[PDB]
Amino acid sequence: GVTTEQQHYRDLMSAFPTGIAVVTSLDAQGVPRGMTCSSVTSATLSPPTLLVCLRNGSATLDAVSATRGFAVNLLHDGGRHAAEVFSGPDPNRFSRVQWKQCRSGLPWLSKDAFAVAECRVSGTQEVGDHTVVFGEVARIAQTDGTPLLYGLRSFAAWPL
Amino acid sequence: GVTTEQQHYRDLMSAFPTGIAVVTSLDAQGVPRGMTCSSVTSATLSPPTLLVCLRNGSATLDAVSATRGFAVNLLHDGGRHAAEVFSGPDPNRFSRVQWKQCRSGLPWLSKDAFAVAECRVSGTQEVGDHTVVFGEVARIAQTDGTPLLYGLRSFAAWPL
Ligand SMILES: Cc1cc2nc3c(=O)[nH]c(=O)nc-3n(C[C@H](O)[C@H](O)[C@H](O)COP(=O)(O)OP(=O)(O)OC[C@H]3O[C@@H](n4cnc5c(N)ncnc54)[C@H](O)[C@@H]3O)c2cc1C
Ligand SMILES: Cc1cc2nc3c(=O)[nH]c(=O)nc-3n(C[C@H](O)[C@H](O)[C@H](O)COP(=O)(O)OP(=O)(O)OC[C@H]3O[C@@H](n4cnc5c(N)ncnc54)[C@H](O)[C@@H]3O)c2cc1C
Ligand SMILES: Cc1cc2nc3c(=O)[nH]c(=O)nc-3n(C[C@H](O)[C@H](O)[C@H](O)COP(=O)(O)OP(=O)(O)OC[C@H]3O[C@@H](n4cnc5c(N)ncnc54)[C@H](O)[C@@H]3O)c2cc1C
Ligand SMILES: Cc1cc2nc3c(=O)[nH]c(=O)nc-3n(C[C@H](O)[C@H](O)[C@H](O)COP(=O)(O)OP(=O)(O)OC[C@H]3O[C@@H](n4cnc5c(N)ncnc54)[C@H](O)[C@@H]3O)c2cc1C
């Protein structure tokens, strides 16, 4: 029954660095929604499926649920400003980055991302106040780029 | 082997770098098992819950499923050899690293890890030929260290 304290858990997870995505979708009104997301994780190749973990009540999760699809925009190492915009309190985040619609309508961050994966929601699992969203990847557009990172409470860039 | 569609997905996920864990457990017969794992992700803070995604039929998933506990060993930048051992074909991996048994029985990679988190399995979800394993974190030990990273088909060190 023993359970670690929340702060010790944050200190642990802060020491597992990751890339950074902006996960996007459309709300029921057709308005683009999205957030900075470091919980992008590969699940399986058969068929290609990733997952993300989104806060319950977030605008992005609501949009993902309404559209049943989402785009994962992997940020290159020039993308820190986008990652800040998409994790902070600013209104109208899509007015502050360049973006375009995918053929599906999903928002693509065309200047700040080096890759965009369009996903269909294939399932969800609530865990506490979050939801794990499974995304079956439908289409990928990918260019050369050096990934942005986040870890130990800082932004960095892939070093190689 | 992989299909063309799976290869494009691999190319995408390769470009999302991460830290590196070795996920360990004991199998039903008490033998240590483990694997190199980059799928560590945070699920929720209340209670502290992470997830990992493990291949179905792997020795490590069999052990985790049988005993319902596992340790997440986060590797420092001196831990590349352990990451290679725990992802390679040789099942004799625990004779190739220095390790210690926790009080609970879980294997701790004492020389190669800067943090260890002991987890109880709180749920699972099969996805294709993998299983997402939710771990409620029971205990963490952590020291300063530079995380090992993997991305773009290479190991690297967190750059600070
Ligand atoms: C590196 C990093 C990684 C992250 N990874 C994840 C992850 O994997 N999963 C996750 O759930 N979260 C994650 N976050 C947090 C997430 O980016 C923010 O919570 C984001 O604001 C969520 O946006 P939203 O529009 O979906 O949600 P909402 O919180 O519903 O915000 C709606 C809108 O209100 C505004 N707003 C934003 N924050 C606030 C606020 N505090 N108060 C008032 N208005 C606000 C913005 O315009 C926002 O678009 C991460 C943050 C960082 C920095
Ligand atoms: C999966 C995930 C979910 C998030 N959910 C929210 C949320 O519900 N509301 C919000 O305002 N911001 C949320 N965020 C943003 C988060 O609280 C931090 O602001 C952001 O992750 C940057 O924190 P840090 O690493 O600098 O430091 P810390 O705040 O010390 O976080 C360290 C690590 O702890 C984990 N973590 C932190 N907060 C949460 C959380 N609330 N739920 C799950 N894991 C967490 C993440 O892995 C994070 O990288 C979330 C981030 C992630 C990655
Ligand atoms: C979630 C996950 C599951 C894995 N499952 C297996 C497995 O069942 N059998 C095996 O022999 N090795 C598996 N591996 C190891 C994997 O095949 C690669 O050898 C390892 O991730 C390093 O690959 P790479 O990044 O150098 O290049 P690549 O082989 O090009 O892989 C690139 C990325 O694709 C993703 N990926 C690759 N293979 C898989 C897979 N099978 N399932 C889900 N995502 C995958 C990972 O995110 C990986 O980093 C898995 C890795 C991960 C992260
Ligand atoms: C950077 C990186 C990240 C990765 N991330 C992931 C991830 O997140 N998820 C994932 O699933 N994989 C991941 N992998 C792949 C994973 O580390 C390897 O597939 C690993 O070898 C699995 O180990 P295992 O002992 O659990 O599995 P197994 O594949 O069962 O066994 C490994 C080897 O031992 C043999 N063996 C197993 N059991 C026995 C036994 N009882 N007696 C004799 N021989 C036996 C097998 O035949 C095989 O040769 C990753 C790899 C890399 C390089």
Author numbering:
A (entry chain B), B (entry chain A): 7 to 166
Copy text from the publication:
The gene cluster containing the thal gene also encodes the flavin reductase ThdF. Hence, ThdF might provide reduced FADH2 for Thal in S. albogriseolus. In contrast, our steady-state kinetics showed that flavin reduction in ThdF follows an ordered sequential mechanism, with FAD binding as the first substrate followed by NADH and the respective products being released in reverse order.
The crystallization trials of ThdF in the presence of elastase resulted in two well-diffracting crystal forms (space groups: form 1: P212121; form 2: P21) of different packing with a resolution of 1.14 Å and 1.31 Å. Surprisingly, in both crystal forms, two FADs with very well-defined electron density were visible per ThdF molecule. The FAD closer to the dimer interface is stacked, bringing the adenine base and the isoalloxazine ring into close proximity. The stretched flavin forms 14 polar contacts to surrounding amino acids. The adenosine is flexible and adopts a flipped conformation in chain A of crystal form 1, suggesting that FMN should be able to bind almost as well as FAD. In ThdF, the two isoalloxazine rings are in parallel planes but orthogonal with ring III (two carbonyl moieties) of the stretched FAD (yellow carbon atoms) and ring I (two methyl groups) of the stacked FAD (wheat carbon atoms) being opposite of each other. This means that the central rings (ring II) are not directly above each other, which results in the two N5 atoms being relatively far apart (6.7 Å). The stacked FAD bound in the NADH binding site in two of our structures most likely does not represent a functional state. We assume that the unphysiologically low salt concentration during crystallization may favor the presumably nonphysiological state with two FADs per ThdF protomer.
